Design a protein around this nucleic acid. Sequence first.
RNA 1: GACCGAUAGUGAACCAGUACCGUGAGGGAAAGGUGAAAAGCACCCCGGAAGGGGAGUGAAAUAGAACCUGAAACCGUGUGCUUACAAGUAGUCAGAGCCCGUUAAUGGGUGAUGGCGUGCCUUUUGUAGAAUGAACCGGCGAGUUACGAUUUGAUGCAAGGU
RNA 2: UUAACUUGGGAGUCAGAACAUGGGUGAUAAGGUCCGUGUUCGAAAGGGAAACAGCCCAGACCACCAGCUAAGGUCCCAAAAU
RNA 3: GACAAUGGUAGGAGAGCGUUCUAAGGGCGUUGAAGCAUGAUCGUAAGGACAUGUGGAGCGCUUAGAAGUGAGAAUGCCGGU
Lengths: 100, 53, 111, 116, 143
Amino acid sequence: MFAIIETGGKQIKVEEGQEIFVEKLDVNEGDTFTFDKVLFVGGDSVKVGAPTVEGATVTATVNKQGRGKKITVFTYKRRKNSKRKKGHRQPYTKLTIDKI
Amino acid sequence: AVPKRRTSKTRKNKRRTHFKISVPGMTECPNCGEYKLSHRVCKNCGSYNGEEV
Amino acid sequence: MEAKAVARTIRIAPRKVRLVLDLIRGKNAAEAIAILKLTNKASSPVIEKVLMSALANAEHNYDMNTDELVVKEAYANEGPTLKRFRPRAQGRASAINKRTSHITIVVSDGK
Amino acid sequence: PRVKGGTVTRARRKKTIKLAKGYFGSKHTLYKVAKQQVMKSGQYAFRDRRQRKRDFRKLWITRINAAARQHEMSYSRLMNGLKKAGIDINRKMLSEIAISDEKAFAQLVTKAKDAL
Amino acid sequence: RQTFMANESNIERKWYVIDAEGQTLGRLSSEVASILRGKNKVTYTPHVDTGDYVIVINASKIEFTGNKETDKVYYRHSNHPGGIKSITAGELRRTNPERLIENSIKGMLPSTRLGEKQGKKLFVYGGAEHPHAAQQPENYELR
RNA sequence: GACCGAUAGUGAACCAGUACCGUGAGGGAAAGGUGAAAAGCACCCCGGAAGGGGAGUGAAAUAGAACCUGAAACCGUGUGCUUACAAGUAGUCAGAGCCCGUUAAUGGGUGAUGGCGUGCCUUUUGUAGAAUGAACCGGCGAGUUACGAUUUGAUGCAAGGU
RNA sequence: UUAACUUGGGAGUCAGAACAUGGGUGAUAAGGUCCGUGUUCGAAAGGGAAACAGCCCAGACCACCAGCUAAGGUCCCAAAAU
RNA sequence: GACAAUGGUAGGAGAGCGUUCUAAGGGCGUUGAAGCAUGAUCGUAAGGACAUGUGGAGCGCUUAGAAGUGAGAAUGCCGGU
Ligand SMILES: [Mg+2]
């Protein structure tokens, strides 16, 4: 089956044995995390289907926490002397799904 | 009248697609055993062989 | 196993040479001696006299036969110019670039 | 002491040209031409991180609309009921249900008609 | 991340034949220019060719309301000086009814590197027969 | 010598006020580097000769008098992906298919098709502007020092400071 | 609700433009010109007005393949009611 | 850890990277320096390393000092193409 989790202000369709981008949580590596808020859990035959269904929690297992690729942010304006230049590395968290 | 722009290196190499020379159109002079240009005589020993020159 | 014979700073232009070197590339060496002796251009006996040095440095001192040889690559690089002028009308003067060239013939034998 | 202009005009004019490989013709070789394409290829990208987020929503709405019309319901009748019948949380990236499992997408359409 | 992109060997495109009799000209050509772009199906993506082949028979019985039969004209030009040529939609039904529908549809198709390939999934015939019986179409009840 | 290190410092590190320009007074540049030691390529071979390729001297000639290191522009030869029904400030974001395998990280090259997108400065109430400037690449090229003035920050003493 | 006066250090600016609304001059002419009050451009990106510094909604710290709305829109090109 | 701010040309204020040189403390270098070339790396920016190739004898780091201290444009000046 599958289930829909809500992690970082947005929703992720995840099934089993699966690795994901999730934005940053507060766990060290090698730990275990639990999603207590699942939305539409069930495949073809298994159904509940509910507004923020209660009872089912989904586990995870953290593989690494690191930073993404550097996204260089440049912005100029013509005929003038204006410019800016930055750089950004959005930190993520990689998981692995163990049970629905 | 003068050029308005600097003609690039893509537009330059295209224009000399058709700028080349062709093969001479040789034969084998059958008495001496050389190459000669056809309908001409041999610069070595050689007959014309329809004329023996 | 392959030889070469580089002639350098020949008085002729570098774009008029590589029309003739374009014509013989990847061809048998027995023909390419006798193609340069039938074309009526100005850089044919010059290229010919350096092809007959890659065909004598491949038989002498490497000791390979000159019946199987094939022209692998033949390319004309560029050598230094000789800037001379030409007195032109109304007190002006234009620069005339007499260019020179480097010629390299490399023969092979398929091994 | 005379500060000679050293090896800083090598390096500063490489790390712009090396950003600009893959461009046509002279825009990857010359300094001045590949400089001012790098200033525009970090300006086009700045309005294309903001535009990417709203032009993948002009696609998810197109798929849902081409899913409810075969169950004979509009799109605007579908994201009406699922705010009002249920408190089915607003999601359009999860039109992946309609592609994957048509049997799963059918019970939502049952619950939308049920309390509208 | 979790999105789908249907590509060159992940879709099929089956055939439709539509009886174009007894209904108006630009109310028909919207349930054809959306079949050719493929907005009747999920797994619609941009930048590929989804959609369905559409065949149109009975081009001779399309309609007009008001004096469009005499006051709708089809200006075209020819790039010589003084070359504009006029033709009306009352003499275009009788003379060449295969072109009349075929430009009522191709004005509704996108930017024209792929919108040239989408438009050529459309076969417009004048009578009631078609030689595409070897491709197995079906009737499409369009709204 | 908290002075320069061959576009620098004398105009001049090279046999310089010399080639060269002017009737005349007068104007005036360009040039440096083999190797530790010339041990500067004996002899054979293609060539009319140049220039090569072997053998040799040398730590190295891929340092051979075009002689230390050898950047870019610009001209070449080779090859993985790609292009002959298309309207392009040449990029960007979404992305099939193909050939690869790095400083190991949610990798690299190429790009069928879709969306947005009228170069950079300078002067303007306002420039894609058909207003100005640059052919390209490389060097050089502009708020400095002195003796005073005034305010601010520091510090030494303080009815006295110097 | 959160500014305002005082004393000292450092510059810039003195060519302004459309639109709205009270009037002069012109012809109840001009994208005209000269004054009073307000806004935007000047020094402002973004969505809309097909294209368009000045009109209408609204002021970008950077990231996300989440959400609700303004001016304007819902047949098709082109997201949403034939 | 709460609640706040962060478009910007003339212009005012603050905080930093880098280049040649000198003084003092420490250090690498023919088992190969500077320089140049290729690379998928690191920092909020200017900018810093490291890994093979070419190169053949001098160079960086921490604190402070002093400037002939930073080039895309001047129908800029000499050289090359
Ligand atoms: Mg023009």
